[PDB]
Amino acid sequence: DIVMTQTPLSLSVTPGQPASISCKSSESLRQSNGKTSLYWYRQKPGQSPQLLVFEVSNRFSGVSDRFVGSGSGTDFTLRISRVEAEDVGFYYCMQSKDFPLTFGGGTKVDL
Amino acid sequence: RVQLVESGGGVVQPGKSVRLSCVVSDFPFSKYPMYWVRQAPGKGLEWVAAISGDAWHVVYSNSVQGRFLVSRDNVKNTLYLEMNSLKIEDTAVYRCARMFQESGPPRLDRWSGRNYYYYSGMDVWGQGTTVTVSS
Amino acid sequence: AVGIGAVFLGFLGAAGSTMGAASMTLTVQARLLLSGIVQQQNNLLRWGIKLQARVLAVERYLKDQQLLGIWGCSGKLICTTAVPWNTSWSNKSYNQIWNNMTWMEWEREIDNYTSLIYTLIEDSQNQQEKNEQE
Amino acid sequence: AVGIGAVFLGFLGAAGSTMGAASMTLTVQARLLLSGGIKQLQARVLAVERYLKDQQLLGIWGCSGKLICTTAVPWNTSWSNKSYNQIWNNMTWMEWEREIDNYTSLIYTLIEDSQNQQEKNEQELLELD
Amino acid sequence: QLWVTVYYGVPVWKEATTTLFCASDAVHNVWATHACVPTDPNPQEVVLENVTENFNMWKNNMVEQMHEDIISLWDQSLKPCVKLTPLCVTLNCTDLRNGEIKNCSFNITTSMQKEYALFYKLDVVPIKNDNTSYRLISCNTSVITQACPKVSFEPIPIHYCAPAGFAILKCNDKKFNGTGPCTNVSTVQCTHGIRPVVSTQLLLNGSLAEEEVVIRSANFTDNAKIIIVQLNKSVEINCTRPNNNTRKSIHIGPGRAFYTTGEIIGDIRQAHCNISGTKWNDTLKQIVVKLKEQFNKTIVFNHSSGGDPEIVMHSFNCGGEFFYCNSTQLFNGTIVLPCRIKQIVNMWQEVGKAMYAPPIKGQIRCSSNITGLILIRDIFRPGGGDMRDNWRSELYKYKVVKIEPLGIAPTKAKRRVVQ
Amino acid sequence: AEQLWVTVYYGVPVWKEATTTLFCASDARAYDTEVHNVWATHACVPTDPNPQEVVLENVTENFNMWKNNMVEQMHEDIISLWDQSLKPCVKLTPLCVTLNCTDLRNEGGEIKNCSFNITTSMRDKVQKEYALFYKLDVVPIKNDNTSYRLISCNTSVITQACPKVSFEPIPIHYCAPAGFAILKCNDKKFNGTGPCTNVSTVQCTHGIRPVVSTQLLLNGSLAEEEVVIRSANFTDNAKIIIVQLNKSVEINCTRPNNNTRKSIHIGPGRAFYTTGEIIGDIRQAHCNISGTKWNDTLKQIVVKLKEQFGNKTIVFNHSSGGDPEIVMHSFNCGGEFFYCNSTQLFNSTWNTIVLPCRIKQIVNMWQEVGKAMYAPPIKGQIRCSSNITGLILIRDTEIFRPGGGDMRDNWRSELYKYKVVKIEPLGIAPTKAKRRVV
Ligand SMILES: *[C@@H]1O[C@H](CO[C@@H]2O[C@@H](C)[C@@H](O)[C@@H](O)[C@@H]2O)[C@@H](O[C@@H]2O[C@H](CO)[C@@H](O[C@@H]3O[C@H](CO[C@H]4O[C@H](CO[C@@H]5O[C@H](CO)[C@@H](O[C@@H]6O[C@H](CO)[C@H](O)[C@H](O)[C@H]6O)[C@H](O)[C@H]5NC(C)=O)[C@@H](O)[C@H](O)[C@@H]4O[C@@H]4O[C@H](CO)[C@@H](O[C@@H]5O[C@H](CO)[C@H](O)[C@H](O)[C@H]5O)[C@H](O)[C@H]4NC(C)=O)[C@@H](O)[C@H](O[C@H]4O[C@H](CO)[C@@H](O)[C@H](O)[C@@H]4O)[C@@H]3O)[C@H](O)[C@H]2NC(C)=O)[C@H](O)[C@H]1NC(C)=O
Ligand SMILES: *[C@@H]1O[C@H](CO[C@@H]2O[C@@H](C)[C@@H](O)[C@@H](O)[C@@H]2O)[C@@H](O[C@@H]2O[C@H](CO)[C@@H](O[C@@H]3O[C@H](CO[C@H]4O[C@H](CO)[C@@H](O)[C@H](O)[C@@H]4O[C@@H]4O[C@H](CO)[C@@H](O)[C@H](O)[C@H]4NC(C)=O)[C@@H](O)[C@H](O[C@H]4O[C@H](CO)[C@@H](O)[C@H](O)[C@@H]4O[C@@H]4O[C@H](CO)[C@@H](O[C@@H]5O[C@H](CO)[C@H](O)[C@H](O)[C@H]5O)[C@H](O)[C@H]4NC(C)=O)[C@@H]3O)[C@H](O)[C@H]2NC(C)=O)[C@H](O)[C@H]1NC(C)=O
Ligand SMILES: *[C@@H]1O[C@H](CO)[C@@H](O[C@@H]2O[C@H](CO)[C@@H](O[C@@H]3O[C@H](CO[C@H]4O[C@H](CO)[C@@H](O)[C@H](O)[C@@H]4O)[C@@H](O)[C@H](O[C@H]4O[C@H](CO)[C@@H](O)[C@H](O)[C@@H]4O)[C@@H]3O)[C@H](O)[C@H]2NC(C)=O)[C@H](O)[C@H]1NC(C)=O
Ligand SMILES: *[C@@H]1O[C@H](CO)[C@@H](O[C@@H]2O[C@H](CO)[C@@H](O[C@@H]3O[C@H](CO)[C@@H](O)[C@H](O)[C@@H]3O)[C@H](O)[C@H]2NC(C)=O)[C@H](O)[C@H]1NC(C)=O
Ligand SMILES: *[C@@H]1O[C@H](CO)[C@@H](O[C@@H]2O[C@H](CO)[C@@H](O)[C@H](O)[C@H]2NC(C)=O)[C@H](O)[C@H]1NC(C)=O
Ligand SMILES: *[C@@H]1O[C@H](CO)[C@@H](O[C@@H]2O[C@H](CO)[C@@H](O)[C@H](O)[C@H]2NC(C)=O)[C@H](O)[C@H]1NC(C)=O
Ligand SMILES: *[C@@H]1O[C@H](CO)[C@@H](O[C@@H]2O[C@H](CO)[C@@H](O)[C@H](O)[C@H]2NC(C)=O)[C@H](O)[C@H]1NC(C)=O
Ligand SMILES: *[C@@H]1O[C@H](CO[C@@H]2O[C@@H](C)[C@@H](O)[C@@H](O)[C@@H]2O)[C@@H](O)[C@H](O)[C@H]1NC(C)=O
Ligand SMILES: *[C@@H]1O[C@H](CO)[C@@H](O)[C@H](O)[C@H]1NC(C)=O
Ligand SMILES: *[C@@H]1O[C@H](CO)[C@@H](O)[C@H](O)[C@H]1NC(C)=O
Ligand SMILES: *[C@@H]1O[C@H](CO)[C@@H](O)[C@H](O)[C@H]1NC(C)=O
Ligand SMILES: *[C@@H]1O[C@H](CO)[C@@H](O)[C@H](O)[C@H]1NC(C)=O
Ligand SMILES: *[C@@H]1O[C@H](CO)[C@@H](O)[C@H](O)[C@H]1NC(C)=O
Ligand SMILES: *[C@@H]1O[C@H](CO)[C@@H](O)[C@H](O)[C@H]1NC(C)=O
Ligand SMILES: *[C@@H]1O[C@H](CO)[C@@H](O)[C@H](O)[C@H]1NC(C)=O
Ligand SMILES: *[C@@H]1O[C@H](CO)[C@@H](O)[C@H](O)[C@H]1NC(C)=O
Ligand SMILES: *[C@@H]1O[C@H](CO)[C@@H](O)[C@H](O)[C@H]1NC(C)=O
Ligand SMILES: *[C@@H]1O[C@H](CO)[C@@H](O)[C@H](O)[C@H]1NC(C)=O
Ligand SMILES: *[C@@H]1O[C@H](CO)[C@@H](O)[C@H](O)[C@H]1NC(C)=O
Ligand SMILES: *[C@@H]1O[C@H](CO)[C@@H](O)[C@H](O)[C@H]1NC(C)=O
Ligand SMILES: *[C@@H]1O[C@H](CO)[C@@H](O)[C@H](O)[C@H]1NC(C)=O
Ligand SMILES: *[C@@H]1O[C@H](CO)[C@@H](O)[C@H](O)[C@H]1NC(C)=O
């Protein structure tokens, strides 16, 4: 039902860059418990997806200290400082307010 | 580590029915919801199905209602999806997914008299498995 | 979050049932009369009016528990009596109403006679049985 | 110019003890639950409105006026993997009400509509003889 | 025989007039928490099977509830705000250079002369032989108070929930006019989102019917009740304020400053409104289908006006700023509307109690939906002014009932004698 | 095996954390007969408690001195006790008048008495006057030769306080309403957070004198014979250093100027007062600390400041930043307000002092910007001995400076033990028994 968008997806990079991609949704997805449903994933090509950010400005454990997302209400952004060489792949935005679950195109990243 | 392994892959013709399999590692699995996601061969991603840790409630997307069947067996630690009446355009790569948290039992609303299961995002997939419908 | 359908007949749920059928939801109606679900999640940050509505709801509650206390029927939900019926109230017989009619309509047959029932239950059931104690 | 030691028990005095030792102590937590510039009055109603609710739920269960009572609702071993004598001899109450916190709503519905609702339609129709 | 068994907990109800409590979703808005309780977790619904119940939206009190609350919840943030008595002097007001904005001059309102101000045309009034001089329009009537600048104005998606012993009912039939019984009934803990939107002649940011249009009135075989029409397919409106404004707070009286307008950067241009001329034409023809039911076939075309500038114009809010739009030209693809911005208003048409708007610097533009219209026949001509019927546009379903728990019925069970 | 059935229990001693309303329960002696004690509001609740206490000895409750709600309910209530008392007193709006102020015969201070025309309650004719005005409340205005104006005219209103009332900080005992048990940690090694050992249960909290002071804490309450210092992260730089020292440091501060009574013009039934004459010779007010013990004190502090990193580089530094109201040390003394210079108190260390005090009259409310109370003193000189049981520092060779912008942190030092929990008395458990069914 509820859908969402991204930025222009292909974004070539610079080592040590403030990389940021928004994901504006068609709803304020704040649940009843005050937990904002937002899930940032990533896959390198040829791999499964992999979790980066499980809630707004909450990095997932076991993943490095360079991934600081944000957002509120409709728009939600994922800011990455210190862009490295292990950043190649797609970025999957995700809703979790209500079924069905949606995603995006997956923002292409190369050098 | 929770090492979800996925299997049962098969490439067939349309009008048929196949079944996948998803097995876990080091993992209690009785209190965990599962999912199924779809990487069409050039597309981004789209959710398919969802199940409880109770295996009592199963929600789908609009499309595959009347086609699919999700069923857990926490004794086996193995998830089944018998995909009846395949389409050709549903050729993709299917996965399974442990939920991010551990879910709990339902909490019954005292007023409505109406249960509420809780479903959140996923964090750990399997390696992928292949189902292809062609001729 | 999802939710399957009710299998326990929530608030006001059996209002269309017959009088022999809606009796299974008597517990749900009684519980949620008092305060409902608790609102006012401790947010006292910034009146008078508010708390008069809170005090009345207790007085509505304590009216009835005392009245069931005089009627020898505190704690229960369904209790019998020694009072026979007087058909001048309504002569409508047993299955004419019981397996035929809801509760909103049975109240609209006995509303004129309401206070007349209450003295008779007071006297001939507990003011009577006070003279059987000895 | 006064003072002597403890005689009977204290308020919340059994709240680190076992269940088998706290079960003989319930009256002290039962008495002082109710007695104890508008903002005193807003407390003097919430203390009432919490007391009636706990009084009301005992009333529905056929268990009003008793401190303890039993029902016929069967305990479901899915609710507790704890052994029996661990519960009555090792676990405190404060720990115990973190363990069955989730199941509590299922319990209260499965007392009234399960039994004490059903123990009245069965009860009323044991007449006619 | 028949013995009278007591029944406690039977679900019946009277109808009661009582007090509800507001619950608003969730800085320093007057509707945020200083009027209501914080955020709504979840609204509920139980739909009931075999139940009939009458309804009325004109014998309703929830619609009287807001008119007895928004008159005072708006008033709560008007006691501590700054009253402005000493401005009421001789107002030598001459035209602004590049005359609906007048540069004024007056002796000082100091804490210890010949000061300056400039503001809108419709708040002055002419006086005797020393011409090009003015006075305020409410001095010899009553007091006038500016708003506090730290005050929000946004209508909030409120939720009337229901207190103890009181259930809110809700009919659900699609074929439901303003009155009469209903069959598909349902009980909720709490209402849906309602926003307190103030409007004349129309219905801004309201709610949509189920892909239809249905007018509603009670005595429509009179001119008594206002025929109120809900609209499917909201028409988008655009309204601007292109004049890049500046402000300042010149000193008022002993130890206070008065927020007025500075210079208008950018030359004088009229603030107006837009509407796509295609959508409005088809939308009226939807209604005349339903007018035919209570009567090429477009017998009705005519507009009328007259009286109060609150009623003659089209009054509403935009960004914390009141508008007053001409609507004769619109009734009978963009459409420019001559729309006036008054600054001294009357809050709910009460005699005396006046409120002064904050002059906002910069530029203002807002957009909105439209879900309904206001009409009076004798053919249909747009009314306006009655604030209560804005509230009846939302609460045309709901009802407040008081739970009677207790009942009796005879049976063939007698109390056994205690031994 | 056997069948088990659920068994209901009532009065089960459990709790969850809750946030409820506590109520004032003050002293109740000598509140009558002109004692309009604004803290007591005529003895708020006259209990005079008997603070009993029950040890529990098998209970561990994970406390937190930083996420506590009781300190939040004070800072609501204290300005709320001001606001009802700030209402009926005299408003001072019509006084912001241009002045002509000359030098006063026996430094920057009381040099200027002033004069201005005013017509408050008669509303017929203005009249010039004479007053007594310090610095820290006047401004030499522009385009005029020696003309003054009060510093806070064009803020919100400048209502004073009435002379009936007294700001005397009597100790207030917070008691708990029904269904709530205030708990208290019984370990004096309690570092501020984490668990405790054998938490007890009191009806009502101990002595809390709600005094008001920046940069120190005067009539406080002190721990046992070690010095304990707590903070939030205690590694982070922009936190607050709460200091609890094991002994008291006695302070004397006096106002030698023989200020007197006075008669300034009347509002509508509202006599306003502006400080009457000095006796004829001016001595500037000063605090007067026994500087040996203070010198003894700060070497005792770095004993317990140290043991979290190395054994090197401890110093002490004075404060900085802004106007002197946040620089100089602020405290009250018996219906009178002091801003004292405390730069001398903070010389560095390694591993009878007189301080120049300054007094103003137009005094801001403590945290809100806007309104501001006001009080001219009573006749005679002023003396108040006091104590010190703590001070407030900041981090910045590792630099310690006296910070402070919130006396909630003072109340955090007073309420570092307490926690209010609601009883959930109803509870269930299974056993073999079963209701008799026929
Ligand atoms: C204790 O307790 C318990 C209880 O409790 C519980 O728990 C808790 C914790 C909580 O949770 C609470 O709440 C709860 O309650 C108890 O136990 C119990 O018991 C009972 C008895 O009675 C039971 O019941 C049962 O159930 C079942 C189920 O049901 C469901 O399902 C169905 C179907 O089935 C399925 O099928 C499929 C196909 O075949 C399958 O698959 C398969 O599988 C295999 C393996 O398994 C493999 O895998 C293969 O391959 C595959 O293929 C599956 O599996 C199955 N499942 C199962 C489980 O089995 C159906 O039919 C039904 O109906 C149901 O369904 C459901 O429904 C719902 C509705 O109703 C739905 O929902 C929905 O959804 C949608 C979406 O989709 C929406 O959302 C809506 O809204 C909603 O509503 C869902 O979906 C569905 N699902 C499905 C899946 O389907 C049943 O079946 C049964 O029945 C049977 O039996 C009987 C006996 O008598 C008979 O009679 C009949 O006939 C039949 O046969 C029963 O009923 C339960 O379950 C339980 N529970 C648990 C265990 O938990 C105990 O007892 C106690 N204890 C003591 C001592 O007391
Ligand atoms: C009663 O019901 C409640 C729930 O009731 C509902 O909610 C309450 C509020 C009421 O409203 C009620 O009415 C509702 O119905 C049940 O609570 C559930 O309890 C379980 C377990 O106790 C929780 O599940 C855990 O979640 C952890 C994460 O969530 C916590 O942390 C979040 C942020 O940190 C926080 O936002 C969450 O709120 C949550 O915090 C919890 O909050 C609840 C609130 O009540 C507290 O009670 C909890 O105490 C608190 N949590 C804690 C820990 O204090 C998961 O981390 C955790 O999973 C990990 O641990 C298990 C243990 O065996 C492992 O097996 C897992 O595998 C997992 O370890 C992870 O493994 C992966 C695999 O490698 C690692 O990934 C990384 O992968 C990389 C590659 O991709 C690299 O390889 C890298 O090296 C590697 O690190 C992870 O790092 C690793 N994790 C860590 C930390 O290292 C577990 O799933 C539920 O969250 C909680 N429910 C809810 C809704 O919160 C309660 O059980 C029930 N009781 C009964 C008796 O029925
Ligand atoms: C930290 O704690 C200490 C003590 O615990 C406080 O010190 C006391 O503070 C109070 C408040 O100022 C002092 O009380 C004042 O004492 C003055 C001296 O009175 C003497 O003379 C009378 C004559 O009978 C004796 O009975 C009395 O015992 C004294 O010997 C009084 O004159 C003051 O009264 C004034 O106010 C009333 C109010 O209406 C007027 O009507 C009077 O006319 C008069 O002007 C006042 O009562 C007390 O003396 C202090 N004790 C000391 C210094 O040892 C500290 O104040 C506290 N710290 C802080 C920061 O407050
Ligand atoms: C009808 O509803 C619409 C919303 O769909 C209203 O549009 C809203 O208008 C307000 C101002 O009028 C916008 O408010 C915002 O305020 C903040 C203050 O910090 C400011 O930063 C923003 O730039 C903006 O001004 C609000 O964004 C806007 N909503 C949307 C979605 O754009 C409209 O005002 C309502 N009209 C009536 C008559 O009720
Ligand atoms: C607190 O805990 C201690 C044990 O940790 C309890 O002490 C036991 O008391 C029973 C009663 O006589 C004795 O049989 C045990 O031998 C005691 N334990 C030990 C180790 O000696 C104590 O009773 C608890 N407090 C309360 C109030 O119950
Ligand atoms: C009464 O009206 C309500 C409102 O439309 C109906 O409830 C909806 O039923 C549809 C079924 O197509 C569900 O998809 C919706 O989820 C229901 N609404 C809600 C809020 O859940 C109901 O079916 C109608 N009942 C009758 C007897 O006409
Ligand atoms: C643990 O409990 C003991 C008592 O069981 C506490 O000792 C009390 O300490 C206060 C503090 O001065 C005394 O006034 C009491 O008289 C002591 N009790 C008795 C029975 O003498 C002790 O403080 C608690 N905490 C720790 C850390 O031991
Ligand atoms: C109040 O107004 C002040 C301006 O007043 C004039 O400027 C200062 C420098 C003095 O010369 C004064 O005597 C003059 O009358 C502002 O400086 C001040 O910020 C204002 N206070 C507010 C807005 O709270
Ligand atoms: C009740 O029955 C009596 C006869 O026992 C009769 O006289 C009386 O009229 C009846 N009550 C009413 C209200 O008619
Ligand atoms: C509802 O709106 C559609 C377009 O939004 C319009 O075509 C239709 O006429 C409307 N419904 C009715 C019943 O008029
Ligand atoms: C509204 O509809 C009901 C039937 O649904 C009808 O009886 C009543 O007369 C109608 N009222 C109006 C004003 O059209
Ligand atoms: C509408 O008003 C006319 C005016 O007399 C009246 O005759 C008619 O009865 C009214 N209609 C209804 C339904 O009351
Ligand atoms: C109002 O503006 C929007 C864009 O903000 C535009 O899509 C719409 O066509 C406009 N409506 C008019 C001019 O009626
Ligand atoms: C169609 O034409 C006009 C429309 O203006 C009007 O007279 C009426 O609606 C129709 N005329 C007929 C049917 O003669
Ligand atoms: C102020 O007065 C003094 C003495 O009357 C004079 O020396 C000085 O120049 C004056 N300053 C002015 C007028 O600015
Ligand atoms: C206090 O001691 C406990 C003991 O484990 C520790 O966890 C906590 O971090 C300490 N707090 C401080 C501020 O040192
Ligand atoms: C304390 O020091 C700094 C400042 O916050 C931070 O890097 C460190 O993680 C903090 N430690 C905590 C919060 O435990
Ligand atoms: C304060 O004055 C008292 C009274 O003599 C004295 O005992 C004490 O030592 C003084 N403290 C100083 C001077 O620091
Ligand atoms: C505590 O006080 C005693 C004397 O009362 C003193 O010897 C000791 O040094 C003090 N503790 C610290 C840490 O300074
Ligand atoms: C102490 O700090 C002050 C500033 O607060 C600084 O000027 C002074 O040099 C410092 N002294 C030492 C010894 O660090
Ligand atoms: C203040 O201190 C000075 C010098 O230390 C001393 O002469 C004077 O007597 C003291 N006064 C008081 C009141 O302590
Ligand atoms: C202040 O310190 C002295 C030092 O012995 C002490 O005797 C006195 O009790 C303290 N004051 C208070 C109010 O405790």
PDB file of N, CA, C and O in Angstrom, chain A residues 31 33 39 41 43 48-49 54 92 99 101, chain B residues 39 44-45 47 59 95 100 118-119 121-122 125:
ATOM      1  N   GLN A  31       4.900   4.024  14.405  1.00  0.00           N
ATOM      2  CA  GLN A  31       3.961   3.040  14.914  1.00  0.00           C
ATOM      3  C   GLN A  31       3.327   3.523  16.215  1.00  0.00           C
ATOM      4  O   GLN A  31       3.566   4.636  16.693  1.00  0.00           O
ATOM      5  N   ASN A  33       3.913   2.219  19.136  1.00  0.00           N
ATOM      6  CA  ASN A  33       4.898   2.160  20.207  1.00  0.00           C
ATOM      7  C   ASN A  33       5.955   3.252  20.123  1.00  0.00           C
ATOM      8  O   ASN A  33       6.931   3.200  20.872  1.00  0.00           O
ATOM      9  N   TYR A  39      14.202   0.693   7.642  1.00  0.00           N
ATOM     10  CA  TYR A  39      15.219  -0.348   7.557  1.00  0.00           C
ATOM     11  C   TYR A  39      16.098  -0.104   6.340  1.00  0.00           C
ATOM     12  O   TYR A  39      15.648  -0.257   5.202  1.00  0.00           O
ATOM     13  N   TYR A  41      19.098  -1.382   4.180  1.00  0.00           N
ATOM     14  CA  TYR A  41      19.917  -2.538   3.872  1.00  0.00           C
ATOM     15  C   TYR A  41      20.917  -2.191   2.785  1.00  0.00           C
ATOM     16  O   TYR A  41      20.923  -1.089   2.232  1.00  0.00           O
ATOM     17  N   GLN A  43      23.279  -4.541  -0.380  1.00  0.00           N
ATOM     18  CA  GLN A  43      23.927  -5.704  -0.952  1.00  0.00           C
ATOM     19  C   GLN A  43      25.037  -5.246  -1.876  1.00  0.00           C
ATOM     20  O   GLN A  43      24.869  -4.290  -2.638  1.00  0.00           O
ATOM     21  N   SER A  48      23.954 -11.561  -1.028  1.00  0.00           N
ATOM     22  CA  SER A  48      22.692 -11.307  -0.370  1.00  0.00           C
ATOM     23  C   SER A  48      22.674  -9.881   0.164  1.00  0.00           C
ATOM     24  O   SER A  48      23.722  -9.244   0.289  1.00  0.00           O
ATOM     25  N   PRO A  49      21.498  -9.352   0.484  1.00  0.00           N
ATOM     26  CA  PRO A  49      21.440  -8.101   1.243  1.00  0.00           C
ATOM     27  C   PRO A  49      22.011  -8.260   2.641  1.00  0.00           C
ATOM     28  O   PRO A  49      22.218  -9.359   3.157  1.00  0.00           O
ATOM     29  N   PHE A  54      18.728  -0.255  11.391  1.00  0.00           N
ATOM     30  CA  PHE A  54      17.471  -0.907  11.723  1.00  0.00           C
ATOM     31  C   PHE A  54      16.399   0.052  12.205  1.00  0.00           C
ATOM     32  O   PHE A  54      15.226  -0.330  12.251  1.00  0.00           O
ATOM     33  N   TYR A  92      18.884  -0.398  -0.113  1.00  0.00           N
ATOM     34  CA  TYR A  92      17.479  -0.776  -0.073  1.00  0.00           C
ATOM     35  C   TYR A  92      16.802  -0.105   1.113  1.00  0.00           C
ATOM     36  O   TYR A  92      17.111  -0.407   2.271  1.00  0.00           O
ATOM     37  N   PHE A  99       1.564  -4.090   6.335  1.00  0.00           N
ATOM     38  CA  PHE A  99       1.659  -4.969   5.189  1.00  0.00           C
ATOM     39  C   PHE A  99       0.856  -4.410   4.020  1.00  0.00           C
ATOM     40  O   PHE A  99      -0.212  -3.831   4.224  1.00  0.00           O
ATOM     41  N   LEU A 101       4.985  -4.983   2.478  1.00  0.00           N
ATOM     42  CA  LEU A 101       6.268  -4.337   2.673  1.00  0.00           C
ATOM     43  C   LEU A 101       6.828  -3.912   1.326  1.00  0.00           C
ATOM     44  O   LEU A 101       6.693  -4.630   0.334  1.00  0.00           O
TER      45      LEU A 101
ATOM     46  N   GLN B  39      13.948 -11.312  -5.592  1.00  0.00           N
ATOM     47  CA  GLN B  39      14.846 -10.573  -6.477  1.00  0.00           C
ATOM     48  C   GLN B  39      14.582 -11.063  -7.892  1.00  0.00           C
ATOM     49  O   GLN B  39      15.142 -12.064  -8.336  1.00  0.00           O
ATOM     50  N   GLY B  44      14.681  -4.485  -8.165  1.00  0.00           N
ATOM     51  CA  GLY B  44      15.217  -4.225  -6.847  1.00  0.00           C
ATOM     52  C   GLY B  44      14.930  -5.321  -5.845  1.00  0.00           C
ATOM     53  O   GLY B  44      15.814  -6.142  -5.573  1.00  0.00           O
ATOM     54  N   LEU B  45      13.678  -5.395  -5.375  1.00  0.00           N
ATOM     55  CA  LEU B  45      13.226  -6.338  -4.352  1.00  0.00           C
ATOM     56  C   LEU B  45      11.732  -6.153  -4.126  1.00  0.00           C
ATOM     57  O   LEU B  45      11.220  -5.047  -4.319  1.00  0.00           O
ATOM     58  N   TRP B  47       8.637  -7.829  -1.181  1.00  0.00           N
ATOM     59  CA  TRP B  47       8.189  -8.791  -0.187  1.00  0.00           C
ATOM     60  C   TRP B  47       7.177  -9.764  -0.781  1.00  0.00           C
ATOM     61  O   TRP B  47       6.406  -9.420  -1.678  1.00  0.00           O
ATOM     62  N   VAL B  59       0.414 -13.973   6.482  1.00  0.00           N
ATOM     63  CA  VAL B  59      -0.031 -12.913   5.590  1.00  0.00           C
ATOM     64  C   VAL B  59       0.794 -12.982   4.310  1.00  0.00           C
ATOM     65  O   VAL B  59       1.967 -13.374   4.322  1.00  0.00           O
ATOM     66  N   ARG B  95      14.298 -16.115  -1.047  1.00  0.00           N
ATOM     67  CA  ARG B  95      15.112 -16.201   0.151  1.00  0.00           C
ATOM     68  C   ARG B  95      14.204 -16.376   1.358  1.00  0.00           C
ATOM     69  O   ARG B  95      12.983 -16.263   1.265  1.00  0.00           O
ATOM     70  N   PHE B 100      14.197  -9.336  12.863  1.00  0.00           N
ATOM     71  CA  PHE B 100      15.252  -8.602  13.561  1.00  0.00           C
ATOM     72  C   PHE B 100      15.237  -8.869  15.058  1.00  0.00           C
ATOM     73  O   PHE B 100      16.216  -9.372  15.616  1.00  0.00           O
ATOM     74  N   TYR B 118       2.810  -9.298  16.260  1.00  0.00           N
ATOM     75  CA  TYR B 118       3.737  -8.205  16.012  1.00  0.00           C
ATOM     76  C   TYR B 118       4.812  -8.658  15.043  1.00  0.00           C
ATOM     77  O   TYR B 118       5.490  -9.659  15.285  1.00  0.00           O
ATOM     78  N   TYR B 119       4.978  -7.908  13.962  1.00  0.00           N
ATOM     79  CA  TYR B 119       5.910  -8.226  12.893  1.00  0.00           C
ATOM     80  C   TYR B 119       6.799  -7.024  12.640  1.00  0.00           C
ATOM     81  O   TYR B 119       6.300  -5.914  12.440  1.00  0.00           O
ATOM     82  N   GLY B 121      11.033  -5.757  11.020  1.00  0.00           N
ATOM     83  CA  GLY B 121      11.939  -6.014   9.919  1.00  0.00           C
ATOM     84  C   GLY B 121      12.797  -7.250  10.120  1.00  0.00           C
ATOM     85  O   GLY B 121      12.789  -7.902  11.161  1.00  0.00           O
ATOM     86  N   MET B 122      13.556  -7.581   9.084  1.00  0.00           N
ATOM     87  CA  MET B 122      14.420  -8.750   9.085  1.00  0.00           C
ATOM     88  C   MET B 122      15.880  -8.325   9.058  1.00  0.00           C
ATOM     89  O   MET B 122      16.212  -7.192   8.714  1.00  0.00           O
ATOM     90  N   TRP B 125      19.505 -13.179   6.276  1.00  0.00           N
ATOM     91  CA  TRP B 125      18.928 -14.022   5.247  1.00  0.00           C
ATOM     92  C   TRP B 125      19.688 -15.329   5.129  1.00  0.00           C
ATOM     93  O   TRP B 125      20.574 -15.645   5.925  1.00  0.00           O
TER      94      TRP B 125
END
